[PDB]
Coordinates of C-alpha atoms in Angstrom, one line a residue:
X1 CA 0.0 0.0 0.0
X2 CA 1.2 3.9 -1.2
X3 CA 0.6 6.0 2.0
X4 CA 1.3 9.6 2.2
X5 CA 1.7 11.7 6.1
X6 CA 1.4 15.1 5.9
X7 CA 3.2 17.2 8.7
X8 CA 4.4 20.9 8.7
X9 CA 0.9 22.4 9.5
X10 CA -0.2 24.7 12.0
X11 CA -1.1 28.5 13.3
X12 CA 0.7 31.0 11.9
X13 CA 0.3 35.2 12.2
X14 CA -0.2 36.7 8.4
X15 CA 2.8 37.3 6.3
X16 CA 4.5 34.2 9.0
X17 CA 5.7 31.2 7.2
X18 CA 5.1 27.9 6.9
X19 CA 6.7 24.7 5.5
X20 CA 4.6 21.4 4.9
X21 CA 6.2 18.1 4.2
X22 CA 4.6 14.5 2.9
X23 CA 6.4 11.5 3.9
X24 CA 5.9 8.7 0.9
X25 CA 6.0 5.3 1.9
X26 CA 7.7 4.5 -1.4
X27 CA 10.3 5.8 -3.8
X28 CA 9.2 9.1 -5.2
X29 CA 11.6 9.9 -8.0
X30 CA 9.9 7.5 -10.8
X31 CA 6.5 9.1 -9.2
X32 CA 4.6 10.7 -12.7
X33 CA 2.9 14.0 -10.5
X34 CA 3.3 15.0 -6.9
X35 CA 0.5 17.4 -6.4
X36 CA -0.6 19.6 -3.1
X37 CA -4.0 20.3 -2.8
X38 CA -6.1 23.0 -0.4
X39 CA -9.5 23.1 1.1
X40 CA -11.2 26.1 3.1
X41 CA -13.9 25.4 5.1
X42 CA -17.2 25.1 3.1
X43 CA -15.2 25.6 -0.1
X44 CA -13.9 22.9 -3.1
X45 CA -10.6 21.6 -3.2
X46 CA -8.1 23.3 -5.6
X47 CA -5.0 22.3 -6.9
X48 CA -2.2 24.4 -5.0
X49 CA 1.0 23.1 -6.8
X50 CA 2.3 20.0 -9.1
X51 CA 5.4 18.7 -9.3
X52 CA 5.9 16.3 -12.8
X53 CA 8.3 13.4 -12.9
X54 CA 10.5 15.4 -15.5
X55 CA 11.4 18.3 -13.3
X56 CA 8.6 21.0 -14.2
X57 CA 6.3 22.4 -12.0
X58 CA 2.8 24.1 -12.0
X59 CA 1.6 26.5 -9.4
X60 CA -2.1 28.1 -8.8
X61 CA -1.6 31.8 -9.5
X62 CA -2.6 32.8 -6.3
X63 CA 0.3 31.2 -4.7
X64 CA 2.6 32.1 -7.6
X65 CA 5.7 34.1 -5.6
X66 CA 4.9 32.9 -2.4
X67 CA 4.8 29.0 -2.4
X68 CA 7.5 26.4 -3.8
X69 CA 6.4 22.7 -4.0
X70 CA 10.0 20.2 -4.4
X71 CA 10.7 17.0 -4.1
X72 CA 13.6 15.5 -1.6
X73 CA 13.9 12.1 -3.5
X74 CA 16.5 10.8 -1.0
X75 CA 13.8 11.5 2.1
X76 CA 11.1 10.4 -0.2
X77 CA 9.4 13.8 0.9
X78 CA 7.2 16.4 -0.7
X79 CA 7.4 19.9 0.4
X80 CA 5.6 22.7 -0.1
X81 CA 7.4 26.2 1.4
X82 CA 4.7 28.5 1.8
X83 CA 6.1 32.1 2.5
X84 CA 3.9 35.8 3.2
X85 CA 0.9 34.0 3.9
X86 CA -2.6 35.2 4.2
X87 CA -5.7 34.9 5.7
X88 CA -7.6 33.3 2.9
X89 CA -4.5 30.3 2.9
X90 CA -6.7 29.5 5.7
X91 CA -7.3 25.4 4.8
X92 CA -6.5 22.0 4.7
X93 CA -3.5 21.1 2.5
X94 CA -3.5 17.9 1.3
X95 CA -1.0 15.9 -0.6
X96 CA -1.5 14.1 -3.7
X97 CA -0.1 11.7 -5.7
X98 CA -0.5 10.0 -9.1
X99 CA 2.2 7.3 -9.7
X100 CA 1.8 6.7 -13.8
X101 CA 1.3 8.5 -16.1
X102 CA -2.6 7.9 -17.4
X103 CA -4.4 9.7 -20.3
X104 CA -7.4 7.3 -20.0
X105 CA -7.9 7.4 -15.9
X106 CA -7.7 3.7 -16.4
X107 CA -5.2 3.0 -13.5
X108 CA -6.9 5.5 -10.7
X109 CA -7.0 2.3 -8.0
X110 CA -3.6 1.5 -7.5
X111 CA -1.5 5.0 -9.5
X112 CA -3.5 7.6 -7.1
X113 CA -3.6 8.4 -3.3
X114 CA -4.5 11.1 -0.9
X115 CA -3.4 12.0 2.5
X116 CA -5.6 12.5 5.3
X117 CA -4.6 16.2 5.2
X118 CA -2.6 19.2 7.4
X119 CA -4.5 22.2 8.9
X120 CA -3.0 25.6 8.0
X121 CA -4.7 28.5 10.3
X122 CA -3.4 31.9 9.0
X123 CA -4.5 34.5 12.0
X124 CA -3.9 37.5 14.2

């Protein structure tokens, strides 16, 4: 089983600075996308950042010059720095992960997993 633990979270005044981690209970570096997703209270999720198997990276333009998602393929470990945060980063941030690459959604059962989550409280 492919099982992903989220630490890093916490309460944090605005503009304070964060940095989440995901521990992967395999070896990431062959790992298609690493992705961190967010969800406010009463809101959908929405993809925060992606990291792709070949190096590139896609980030949500709201966190575009504040948040850098990387992977540490010797700890196995995503991380997501998350600098001159705000209120509205308010959420839980959850990691993500799709193993293969698959243009048909065929594989979703055993390429794609979820962690349970990390709260992130941004208040004064």
């Amino acid at each position: 089983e492919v099982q992903l633990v989220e630490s890093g979270g916490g309460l944090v005044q605005p503009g304070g600075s964060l940095r989440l981690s995901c521990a992967v209970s395999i070896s990431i570096f062959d790992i298609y996308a690493m992705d961190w997703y967010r969800q406010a209270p009463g809101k959908q999720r929405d993809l925060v950042a992606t990291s792709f198997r070949d190096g590139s990276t896609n980030y949500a333009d709201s966190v575009k010059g504040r948040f850098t998602i990387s992977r540490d393929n010797a700890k196995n470990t995503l991380y997501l720095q998350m600098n001159s945060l705000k209120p509205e980063d308010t959420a839980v941030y959850l990691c993500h992960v799709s193993l293969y690459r698959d243009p048909l959604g065929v594989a979703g059962g055993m390429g794609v997993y979820w962690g349970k989550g990390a709260l992130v409280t941004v208040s004064s």
